[PDB]
Nucleic acid binder design. Structure first.
Ligand SMILES: [Cl-]
Ligand SMILES: [Mg+2]
Lengths: 276, 267
DNA sequence: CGACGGATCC
DNA sequence: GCTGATGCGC
DNA sequence: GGATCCGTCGGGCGCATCAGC
């Protein structure tokens, strides 16, 4: 069953007009993504803030195209120190953030290049590339430990400002969040353990799934599809990328989009509209 | 005999423009230096990389203004378990390590084209009580740096706690048995240059310039009298000399008993 | 990880 | 410098 | 005996490293 994201809704049902557009995209290799025209799609989307995951590209290797982005001139990049072809995240902002930080506690020694924190006037933005549990779940226990360290990190932000967490959280929360729930409950992304850790994230911090909060019963809405077996053509996918919002930000929430048609990766973009 | 640092030359000998600005500063107490508006000066200088020595501030007590520099958003710190160093970077380093392989004195940041080492070299101490420690530290340091420089071009910056030659301090005759001008320490610095090998960026460009210092004792108004020492260096692999645009001494920036130093590289 | 083969359920 | 093989994780 | 369940298997992608020339 294919899926068509509904039109963009740009006013917080309190009538206010959207003033902030954030796009998040796991690009599956930033240099590949750019050669497949990913940046052309970003220019059309014209977000205020762009968060990317799986850049897999040291900052010295960033294509020049990325420097002719005058609407996204404040750029922050993070790659792991042991694995230059894996992981890596980036945050690009029209306006300069008040503060930027990396990691979830000890990045100066555990240089993982998975998390960026950017503080703006009225909110704190986190973007994350959550560690994959691996084929055959070989890294599932590390993922569970990482999840708990992340929850405690987010909780323990010393800000009174509401939180926006976005990116590839690497779990389809509920059964509606992927096309084959049953044949996947022992696969990375849909174990009981990862689903539980997403559940605890929402409760402990606390946070709301912006998309599901708006479209609580809509099925077949995914953000990832394996390259194999033409899954994307058949919309056999998983919803792995999210905008999760502090409770206070919900009256500001105008919409949470899935940009199903944007190619260039095995994930598609997601976009948030906030009225601030 | 006062000193006016020449203006910044931001063009390489072969005409290529500076692409990399590195600033090193012994802040003599990180919290005090921030209170004395050190971060305001850094925001104006706007380096790509900032190296700090003598931070004397455990990680959990690092002031909050520091995260208010998104232009130096990658921040690395090494505490001694009087010491401590930091390395703040605009771009994400490829790799960052700590120490010299054997006190919170050294951070190593690996970049695309080069490796950056910042060092707070141990002072031989009043009464030379720690000269022997310093001598062992010097040798362990040279040996560690040769390994690094064998894999990539080397930039070494920071407070090396020695005035190499007589021109490098105001009172050479009265200090030939004091920390920072002993025969041993000067020998160690020459061994450092010859063994690795490295070039003294500032002395390479201004070989005949006297009265150029980066440290002055707080006492007896020495900074007002420019009674001081050139203790803070940028040393470079010979391979990088074609990229050298300038090596500056920021005599006027206050907040410490050392002043900042700034390197321009055309990479 | 979706497709596939094989077993099990009423 | 360049290509394609292999390794590894996604 | 159609629907469902469960375990196994082959593999599309990007990037690093290595060999060969
Ligand atoms: Cl960065
Ligand atoms: Mg991926």
């Amino acid at each position: 069953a294919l899926y068509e994201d509904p039109p963009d809704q740009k006013t917080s049902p309190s009538g206010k007009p959207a003033t902030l557009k954030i796009c998040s995209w796991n690009v599956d290799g930033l240099r590949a993504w750019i050669k497949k025209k990913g940046l052309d799609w970003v220019k059309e989307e014209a977000p205020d803030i762009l968060c990317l995951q799986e850049t897999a590209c040291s900052e010295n290797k960033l294509p020049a195209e990325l420097q002719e982005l005058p609407g996204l001139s404040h750029q922050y990049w993070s790659a792991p120190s042991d694995k230059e072809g894996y992981s890596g995240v980036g945050l690009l902002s029209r306006q300069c953030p008040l503060k930027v930080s990396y990691g979830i506690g000890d990045e100066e020694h555990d240089q993982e290049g998975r998390v960026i924190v950017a503080e703006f006037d009225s909110f704190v933005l986190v973007t994350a590339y959550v560690p994959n549990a691996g084929r055959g779940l070989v890294r599932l226990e590390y993922r569970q430990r990482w999840d708990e360290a992340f929850r405690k990190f987010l909780k323990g932000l010393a800000s009174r400002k509401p939180l926006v967490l976005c990116g590839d959280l690497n779990v389809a929360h509920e059964e509606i969040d992927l096309r084959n729930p049953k044949g996947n409950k022992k696969n990375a992304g849909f174990t009981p353990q990862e689903r539980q850790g997403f559940g605890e994230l929402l409760q402990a911090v606390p946070l709301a799934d912006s998309f599901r909060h708006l479209y609580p019963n809509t099925p077949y809405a995914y953000t990832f599809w394996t390259y194999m077996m033409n899954a994307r053509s058949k919309n056999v996918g998983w919803r792995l990328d999210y905008f999760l919002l502090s409770h206070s930000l919900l009256p500001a929430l105008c919409d949470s989009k899935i940009r199903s048609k944007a190619l260039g990766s095995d994930h598609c973009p997601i976009t948030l509209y906030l009225a601030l």
